[PDB]
């Protein structure tokens, strides 16, 4: 009933620690900000473009 792979699958927002931590369909997005240097951390989302999370995917 709705195995678990290996992606743990980690709160969306929230920053990745790779080992599959986030989602596979979902990916580590990591912006910046302008205005002097200041970029704040990266924040795991969801993805539907040709490049995700290296780890496999799970349904």
């Given amino acids: ?3 678990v792979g290996n992606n ?8 990745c620690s790779d080992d599959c931590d986030c989602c596979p369909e ?3 997005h990591c912006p910046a900000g ?7 951390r990266c924040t795991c989302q969801v ?6 999370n290296k ?3 799970a349904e």
């Fill in 26 to 28: 979902h990916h580590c």
């Fill in 34 to 40: 302008k205005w002097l240097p200041g970029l704040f």
């Fill in 8 to 15: 743990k699958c980690w709160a969306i927002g929230t920053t």
């Fill in 1 to 3: 009933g709705t195995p």
């Fill in 55 to 57: 780890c496999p995917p």
């Fill in 47 to 52: 993805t539907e473009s040709d490049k995700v």
